[PDB]
């Protein structure tokens, strides 16, 4: 029954939007909402930010649903490191904020803890909403130089093997024909 | 002025949705719409499919906007191989369809060709809509075994260095502390 807006959305509006997009109101994307909300609230007002998720699970959809950063526009980067953390950072300077879960704060919340630590769901969902940002920690960060590199003006050539267009830098065949092909 | 629906959307509804999500009605996401539409139209009726994009640029947002597959639910995989191609495949069997651009078909469309090949925009946008799926080719594919693997029931441990939770398989530190950290 606790009032828990996520950016401009009510918690119920946010649950609606995320089930629509992600397919299920997954704990990770719900918690993810609180994280992105706290992160945005701790950036300077009106700035243009990029995003980094340190896990591929759930958290990217919280970012995509709530921020202008998407996987397809490149403003969201996903580093698959298995860490339930997101950073939002100034695109010009690389200064930003990282938000992650603080298990030290999940005393009052054993369902969130059992979920987070995969220890072996109506109760879980109520807890996420009650906890809100109380299970989160924030830290100022600055991105490494490589994350703010000029993107390269690549020359497009034709792969002799599959006859598709690809960046010439990738080699004498495209990366698929080199062995990256997922297909039999 | 050509009628060009993209799944359930009109071309104008689709342009609206994609500018909202992606930030700009980028040629890639527009073309991407035609691709995902042709792909879905060539899967058996009513089946549950996963998606693969072979480039990170634009094409993922066409998939995310039009299909239930998202980066965060794991039903969309992005293989960053620089190839403007998407496949949709049966999640159970791995049989699917790959769609890509056929430059052989871009005779009537020099603006699309100049864009696709990066050779050095009101005209480009009109052409994409006029061309529709005429610049696309389709091929039946079956995914390699590794893309249909059972996902591992990982044990969650605490990184001694950063004291965040991570999968024990990753090592004695988490992948960030091992060196994957994007932060200074
Ligand atoms: Cl991950
Ligand atoms: Cl790529
Ligand atoms: Zn090739
Ligand atoms: Zn660590």
Author numbering:
A (entry chain A), B (entry chain A): 1 to 120, 127 to 190
The authors write:
The total β-sheet, α-helical and 310-helical contents are 18, 56 and 4.9%, respectively. The linkers in Q9HJ63_THEAC and Q2LQ23_SYNAS separate the NTD and CTD domains so that the closest edges of the two domains are ∼20 Å apart. Two significant structural differences between Q9HJ63_THEAC and Q2LQ23_SYNAS involve their metal binding. Second, whereas the structure of the CTD of Q2LQ23_SYNAS shows four Cys side chains within coordination distance of the Zn atom, the structure of Q9HJ63_THEAC is atypical for a treble-cleft zinc finger in that three Cys side chains and an Asp side chain are within coordination distance of the zinc. In Q2LQ23_SYNAS no zinc is bound to the NTD.
Here, the first crystal structures from PF02663 are described, representing two bacterial and one archaeal species: B8FYU2_DESHY from the anaerobic dehalogenating bacterium Desulfito­bacterium hafniense DCB-2, Q2LQ23_SYNAS from the syntrophic bacterium Syntrophus aciditrophicus SB and Q9HJ63_THEAC from the thermoacidophilic archaeon Thermoplasma acidophilum. Two of these proteins, Q9HJ63_THEAC and Q2LQ23_SYNAS, contain two domains: an N-terminal thioredoxin-like α+β core domain (NTD) consisting of a five-stranded, mixed β-sheet flanked by several α-helices and a C-terminal zinc-finger domain (CTD). The proximity of fmdE to genes encoding the catalytic subunits suggests a role in methanogenesis for proteins in PF02663. Individual proteins within this family display differences in domain architectures, metal-ion binding propensities and dimer interactions.
